Write a protein that binds this DNA or RNA. Structure first.
Ligand code: MN
Ligand code: MN
Ligand code: MN
Ligand code: MN
Ligand code: MN
Ligand code: MN
Ligand code: MN
Ligand code: MN
Ligand code: MN
Ligand code: MN
Ligand code: MN
Lengths: 87, 95, 106, 97, 97, 82, 106, 95
DNA sequence: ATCAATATCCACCTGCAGATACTACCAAAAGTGTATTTGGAAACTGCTCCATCAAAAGGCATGTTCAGCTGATTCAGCTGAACATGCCTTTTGATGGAGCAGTTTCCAAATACACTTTTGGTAGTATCTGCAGGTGGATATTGAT
DNA sequence: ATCAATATCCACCTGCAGATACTACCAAAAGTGTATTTGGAAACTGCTCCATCAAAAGGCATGTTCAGCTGAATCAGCTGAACATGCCTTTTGATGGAGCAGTTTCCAAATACACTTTTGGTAGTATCTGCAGGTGGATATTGAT
C-alpha cells in the first residue's frame, strides 16, 4: 500500500445547517450562536464511547473490519439499543 | 455458505392474520426481527436470574410467566400471560 | 407427526425457541412448557405491534408497513413506548410535537 | 421583495423535519469523522458501510432526543432560544456528566 | 429577643444533613405506607425488617438525588426556591415521565 | 384524629430530604408533589419485589426480593445481601 | 497440595470463583485461566476501594471503616464513581456540596 | 444452618495487607460483599455475551480481559488488566 | 464599628453494642490423579463487499439587514422561613406464635441417545406492484397595508 | 378587513426498485421412539424473627409575622433568522482485490468422574475496645444597634 490521506478536523464536516436540521426535528425554534460548537463537542463524546466499545469487539474477534454487529452490541452496552441492523 | 435464521416467515404469517392486505418492507421486517430477538433475550434473562435467585436449575413455563410479569407493563402483561397459559394448556392436552 | 407449534396452535416456532433457550445458556434444564409459553408471548407481542403499525400505514394511505409506521405505532401507544423506552428504531423519525410557547400570536 | 418574519420559516422547518425520517447529516462527512475517531483508537481498521450507517442512525437519534430535552430546559428558563447552558443542564440531569 | 434571618438556618441545616447519613423519615409512618402500597399487589403480606430498611434507604437515596436535579432546574430559571415544575422537569429529562 | 398514610411522610421529613440534597428554599406545593413521586417510586419497586415473593411461594417480602427489584429498576443497592 | 490462590499469589479464592463461573451459566465451558484472572481483578478493586476508604477513615480520626467512608471514598474518585454511577451505598449520605448562588451575600 | 458464603474473610485479608491497623464494621463489610458480587456478575455477564457473539463454548482469560476493558473506566481498566495478567503468569510459572 | 446571643469547636470521659479472639465441628468445597472427549487454532482458499476512483448532481458558505428576543433594571406584593412546646405519634423492648427454612422422600419429567422424517434457508431465475418523485393547478397561509 | 406572494395540498400519472413468485436442493433442524436419571414438589416441623402492644420517649403541628424572593412590567441593545448570492463537495454508479468467512484437520485443554484432604462457615462461650454521646468551656458566627 502506497499512501493513505491524513484525517484531521472532520468534526467540522458536521455543518451548521445539518445541526440546525437536527434541532428542527427535535422541535427547536431558536438557536444561539454557540450551539454549533457545543453540539459538535457532544457528538464527539458520544461517538468516542460507541466506537471504543465497537472497536473493542472487533479486536476481540480478531478482525480488521468493524461490522454492524460490533456497533449494535456497543450500542446495547450503553443502553442505546438499535433495531434494524441485524441486532 | 452459512444459514442465518430470522423470524421473518413467522412475522409475515402473523401480519397476514391481522391485516390481510398489508405488506411489510424488508427494513421494517429487519426491525421486527430485531424486536423478536430483543424481547426473547430480555425474557430469558429475567427467567435466568429468577431461577438462580431461587436455586433452580430448570427454566419452566412458571419462570417464563414471572419474567413476563417482571418485564412487560400493565396491560401487555395481563394479555401475554393469558396467551402464554392458553398455549401451554392447549399443548399439555395435545399429546 | 404434528409440530409442537400446532399442538399449541401457534405460528411462532416452538421447536426453534426451545433450541435457542438451550444454546443461550440460561439454565441447566429447560422445561418443555417454557418454549411454548415464550413462543406465545412472542407472537402476542408481534401481533400487537403489527396491528398498530398497520393502522398507521392505513392512516397514511400506504399499503406497505415501513419503519416510520412502527415508530408511530410504538410511540403513540403508552405501553409499547415504555417496553421500548430505551430502543431506537432506525428510520422511524419522531412524533410531530411543537411546544405551545413556540407557536405565534396568542 | 417578500420577507417571512423571524420564526416563521423555522416552524415550517420543524413541521417539515418532524414529518420525515431521512438522515439529516451528509453521509461522507459523517463517515470521515467516524474513521478519524476510530483511527485514533486503532490504526488500519475498515468499516462495513452498514456499521457506519448504524452509527449514524444512533447518533442522530441521540442528538434529536438531546435537542428536545435542551428545548425543555430553555423553555423552563422562560426563553425560546436554546443555549449551551441548556444542553449542559440536560446532560447533567441525564447523568452523562 | 433573638431572630435568625431567612435561609440562615436553612444553610445551617444543609450543612448538618450533608455531614450525616441517618434516615430522615420516621420509620413507622414509612413502614405503614410500604404496607399499604403492597396490599394492592398481594394480601396478607409480612415484611422482613431489613426489607423495609432496604426500601427506606433506596427511597431516601432516590429523593435526595432528585432534589439535587430539582435544585439545578430551579437555579436554571434564576430562582432559589424549588417548585413542582422543577421536579417535573427533572423527571421528564430522567425519562421517568 | 385519623390521617392518610402518605401524609405520615411529613413536611419536616420532606424538608430534611431536600436539605441533604442542598436545597435552600422550598415552595409549599412541593410536599404534595414529593409524596406523589415517592408513591410512584415505591409502587414500581414493591410491585416487582412482591412478584419475586409470590414466585418463591412465600408470604414475607425478603430483603433479597427488594434488592433484586431495585437491581432491575436500574437502582442497585449495596448493603443488604446478594 | 498447594491452593490456586497461593499459586497465583492472591488472597481471593480462585476455587470459589471457578465454581461460581460454571454454576452461573455464563458458558458451556470455563478455561483454567479465567478464574485466576477474574479473582485477581476482584482483589485489585477491593484493594483500591479499601485503600481509599481507609484514608477517609484516617481523615475523620477513626480506625474502623464504616459505610460513610466507602461512600466518601467512591464519589470523591472520578473513576470508582463512574463504575458505581448507578449504585447506592446504604448509609452513605452525600458529599458536602452547596450551590454557590445559595451562599449568603458577603 | 445452610451454609452462607460471603467474601468477607478475603475482604478482611486484603484490608490488612493495605491498612493493617484499620478495622471494618459489618455494614461496611456487607457493602463490600455486595460490591464484590456486583462486579463479578458484570464481568462474568459481559464475558458471557462476548463468547456467545463469537460462537464460542468457553469463557477464557481472553474473555475476562476484554470484559474488563468494556466495563472498567480508563485508569481502572489498565491496572486491572495488568493485575490479572500478572496472576495468570504467576499461576502458570509455578509447579 | 461594639456587643450580646447562641451555635460550633475541641478536649476529655466512659459504658456498651458490636467488634474480636478461640475452640469444636463437620459437610461441603477444593484439590489431586487417571481416562476421555472436543472446542477451536492453524492452515488453505472461495468469493462478498470494502476502498477507491471518475463524473454527475445539489446543498453549503457567506454577508447584509433588522425583527424581536434576551438580559438588565425596578418594584410591589405574596409567600415561605423562623419561631416555642406539650400533645400525641413513634420508638423501644418484651413476648407469643406464623412461616421460613431444614430434611426427606419419591415420581413426572428431565436428559441422553439412535435412526426418520420434515423444513427453513438460499440460489438460480422470472414476472408483478407500491410508491417515490415529477407534473400542473386548485386551496391555504402569511405579512404588507 | 383585502390584496398579493409564495408555500402547500392533493389527486392523477410513468419509471422502477425492491417485493413477491417458483423450482430445486439440502443440511440441519425437528420429530419420533426407547432407555435412564433426577429436580424439586410435597409434606412434615424446628426455631427464628415478625406483628403486636405497653410504657417510655422526643419530634411535629400549630398561627404569627415580615424579610426577601418571585413575577410583572419596561426597555435598550444586539444576536440570530431570513435571504440573496457564488460555487465546492457530496452523491452515485462502476471495479480490482483484501479479508471475511467456509471447510478440514488434530492436539492442547476441558470435562468427568473418583478418592483424599482441607477449609470456610457456624456456633458456643468468652473477651475485648472504638467511639457515640456526654460534659465544660473557649471561640466563632450572626445580627442588633
Ligand atoms: Mn488521528
Ligand atoms: Mn471440533
Ligand atoms: Mn459572497
Ligand atoms: Mn414591599
Ligand atoms: Mn406453622
Ligand atoms: Mn420449504
Ligand atoms: Mn409523492
Ligand atoms: Mn434429588
Ligand atoms: Mn486475500
Ligand atoms: Mn478453618
Ligand atoms: Mn462525639
Amino acid at each position: 500500500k502506497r499512501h493513505r490521506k491524513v484525517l484531521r478536523d472532520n468534526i467540522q464536516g458536521i455543518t451548521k445547517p445539518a445541526i440546525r436540521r437536527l434541532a428542527r426535528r427535535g422541535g427547536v425554534k431558536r438557536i444561539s450562536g454557540l450551539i454549533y460548537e457545543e453540539t459538535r463537542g457532544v457528538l464527539k463524546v458520544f461517538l468516542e464511547n460507541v466506537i471504543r466499545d465497537a472497536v473493542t469487539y472487533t479486536e476481540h474477534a480478531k478482525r480488521k473490519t468493524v461490522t454492524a454487529m460490533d456497533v449494535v452490541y456497543a450500542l446495547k452496552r450503553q443502553g442505546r439499543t438499535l433495531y434494524g441492523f441485524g441486532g | 455458505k452459512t444459514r442465518k435464521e430470522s423470524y421473518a416467515i413467522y412475522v409475515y404469517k402473523v401480519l397476514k392474520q391481522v391485516h390481510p392486505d398489508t405488506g411489510i418492507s424488508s427494513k421494517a421486517m429487519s426491525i421486527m426481527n430485531s424486536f423478536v430477538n430483543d424481547v426473547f433475550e430480555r425474557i430469558a434473562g429475567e427467567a435466568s436470574r429468577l431461577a438462580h435467585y431461587n436455586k433452580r436449575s430448570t427454566i419452566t413455563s412458571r419462570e417464563i410467566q414471572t419474567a413476563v410479569r417482571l418485564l412487560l407493563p400493565g396491560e401487555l402483561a395481563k394479555h401475554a400471560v393469558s396467551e402464554g397459559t392458553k398455549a401451554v394448556t392447549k399443548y399439555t392436552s395435545a399429546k | 407427526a404434528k409440530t409442537r407449534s400446532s399442538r399449541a396452535g401457534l405460528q411462532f416456532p416452538v421447536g426453534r425457541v426451545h433450541r435457542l433457550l438451550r444454546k443461550g445458556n440460561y439454565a441447566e434444564r429447560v422445561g418443555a412448557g417454557a418454549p411454548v409459553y415464550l413462543a406465545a408471548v412472542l407472537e402476542y407481542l408481534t401481533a400487537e405491534i403489527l396491528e398498530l403499525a398497520g393502522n398507521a400505514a392505513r392512516d397514511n394511505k400506504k399499503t406497505r408497513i415501513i419503519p416510520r409506521h412502527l415508530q408511530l405505532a410504538v410511540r403513540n401507544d403508552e405501553e409499547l413506548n415504555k417496553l421500548l423506552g430505551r430502543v431506537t428504531i432506525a428510520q422511524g423519525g419522531v412524533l410531530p410535537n411543537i411546544q405551545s410557547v413556540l407557536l405565534p400570536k396568542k | 421583495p417578500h420577507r417571512y418574519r423571524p420564526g416563521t420559516v423555522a416552524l415550517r422547518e420543524i413541521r417539515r423535519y418532524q414529518k420525515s425520517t431521512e438522515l439529516l447529516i451528509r453521509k461522507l462527512p459523517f463517515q470521515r469523522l467516524v474513521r478519524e475517531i476510530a483511527q485514533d483508537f486503532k490504526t488500519d481498521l475498515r468499516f462495513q458501510s452498514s456499521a457506519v450507517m448504524a452509527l449514524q442512525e444512533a447518533s442522530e437519534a441521540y442528538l434529536v432526543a438531546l435537542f428536545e430535552d435542551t428545548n425543555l430546559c430553555a423553555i423552563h428558563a422562560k426563553r425560546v432560544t436554546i443555549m449551551p447552558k441548556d444542553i449542559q443542564l440536560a446532560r447533567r440531569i441525564r447523568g452523562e456528566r
